[PDB]
Amino acid sequence: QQRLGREVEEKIKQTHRKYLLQEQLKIIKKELGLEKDDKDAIEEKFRERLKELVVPKHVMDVVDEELSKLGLLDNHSSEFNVTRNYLDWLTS
Amino acid sequence: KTSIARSIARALNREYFRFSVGGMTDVAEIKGHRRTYVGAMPGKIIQCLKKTKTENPLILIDEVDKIGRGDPSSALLELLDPEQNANFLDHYLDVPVDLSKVLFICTANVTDTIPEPLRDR
Amino acid sequence: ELGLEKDDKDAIEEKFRERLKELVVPKHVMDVVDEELSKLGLLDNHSSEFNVTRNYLDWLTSIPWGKYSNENLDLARAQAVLEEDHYGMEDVKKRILEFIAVSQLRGSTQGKILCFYGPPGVGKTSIARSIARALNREYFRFSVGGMTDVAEIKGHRRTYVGAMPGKIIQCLKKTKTENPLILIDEVDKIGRGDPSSALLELLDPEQNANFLDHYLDVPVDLSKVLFICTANVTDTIPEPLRDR
Amino acid sequence: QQRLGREVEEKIKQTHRKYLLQEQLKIIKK
Amino acid sequence: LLQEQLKIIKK
Ligand SMILES: Nc1ncnc2c1ncn2[C@@H]1O[C@H](COP(=O)(O)OP(=O)(O)O)[C@@H](O)[C@H]1O
Ligand SMILES: Nc1ncnc2c1ncn2[C@@H]1O[C@H](COP(=O)(O)OP(=O)(O)O)[C@@H](O)[C@H]1O
Ligand SMILES: [Mg+2]
Ligand SMILES: [Mg+2]
């Protein structure tokens, strides 16, 4: 009974469809990357708020410490979210 | 007592915020929560400074006599201290802020029920 | 290897290690630091475990192991600066002078726990700065008023996302000295979730010499830290705290 | 209308570069 | 500007 083999072939076809879906996702992201944000743009985004503020020395040290670790973490870590949200409050 | 607070802010051209502490029981509304906890936010005062975009707004603390128990009354001691406002500490920021320029107005219907540490400040 | 991108990130080891050159690290802390540094060298720099280890080592190498502020043992100028800021208050000034004299006799820095209680507006909170100036000790203040979370005193385990050591270790990192002056205001108005059982581990000469923090998980010697506690009335402070 | 062909070509080039980098990393590991 | 919008819509 080659029905199991036919099902395995259908699963392989589904895997090929997943590969095509990944290729299409890359194709879409190629144009979707425009007008987006990244780890380097967020640094100046936070720093421009401090331009017009008379920031005390200790707050400046804390901000520099958080920005220093900001560039080390990746864009998807939960700790990255925690520090980004902390900076969003601290620099506002 | 409540209505004059907005008129004073209009005359002084200061930003205005109304903080109804009466009936409140959660201390976290004043001093916030640590960064570790998920969904943590700073206290009410930090949001006041954030939304007013000024370090010297008019904060109206309504019904100080109706504060709850079981205790934000001790947390107010770090917020209404005539000389300790320069280093008010919020648990989310974990950074002292200078609240000495903020004009605090507190409303109370009866004097006798305010605790002595707050009544003397 | 030349075609692929390569970075000399291994310098982070001596980047951390240079902080311990002027410190006097105890053996038990140094062993943990060495094991953590060895673990860091194997983790990929993109791993979350690598970031946790890096933060742990950053906290470990920032504690001022063996650093002490140059305490002023001169009685005359210590008394003069105490009379400079506050009038009256003979008892507290006498207590501070006795503390300085005892520290001078034994030839080493001394740690003690003092509690100031009385009517509001007598100068209990303000004198902490004058005492710090007299002793040349670094000054720090945190209020336990309405304290209901133990995590402020003991911190959180580093397994959790974004854990921090807590108030005492933050103070140790900030003041960069192992003998600062701690002012714990409103000790008589501490809340419950129970932080009152955590202060007993801090305000106790018999166990504060090996204070264990949930984040660092390494004992530190707080026996030389001068603790000052402000209260409004004595009869509401917990009995174990009033005992010490 | 014709921008789709240019976008697809750019995406294919980026994917090819990424796969070449992955293959080089695998060769280096081997 | 419309060409970029058309490509974005198609994607
Ligand atoms: N001196 C005053 N002049 C004009 N209106 C007043 C005056 N005092 C109170 N009011 C009126 O009373 C209303 C409610 O007052 P409120 O601020 O609630 O008093 P309280 O703060 O004592 O409760 C307001 O809408 C206001 O118009
Ligand atoms: N003996 C004193 N001499 C001079 N000023 C004093 C004295 N006692 C209190 N003060 C003043 O009182 C103010 C606040 O005192 P504080 O330390 O808040 O008292 P408490 O600790 O009882 O709340 C300080 O700015 C200080 O100048
Ligand atoms: Mg009213
Ligand atoms: Mg005081």
| Distance from first to last alpha carbon of chain A | 69 Å
By oligomeric state, this entry counts as part of a larger assembly
The amount of beta strand of chain A, in percent, is under 5%
Query: Main sheet of chain A?
Result: none
Structural class of chain A: mainly alpha
Helix-strand string of chain A: HHHH
Largest interface, with Cβ-Cβ < 8 Å? Answer: B-C, 22 and 25 residues
Strand elements of chain A, count: 0
The shape of chain A, in one word, is: elongated
Q: List the ions, cofactors and other small molecules found in this model.
A: adenosine-5'-diphosphate, magnesium ion
What is the radius of gyration of chain A? 23 Å
Q: How many helix segments of chain A?
A: 4
Instruction: Specify the helix fraction band of chain A.
Output: over 70%
Question: Can you tell me about this structure?
Answer:
This is part of a larger assembly, with 5 copies of chain A. The first copy, chain A, is mainly alpha-helical. The first copy, chain A, has helices spanning 3-32, 39-47, 57-70, 78-90. In chain A, helix 3 runs antiparallel to helix 4. The longest helix of chain A has 30 residues, at 3-32. The interface between B and C is medium-sized, with 22 and 25 residues. Bound molecules: adenosine-5'-diphosphate (2 copies) and magnesium ion (2 copies). One magnesium ion (MG) binds next to loops of chain C. It is classed as hydrolase. Keywords: ATPase, protease, hydrolase.
Brief summary of the model shown:
Chain A: This is Lon protease homolog, mitochondrial. By secondary structure, chain A is mainly α.
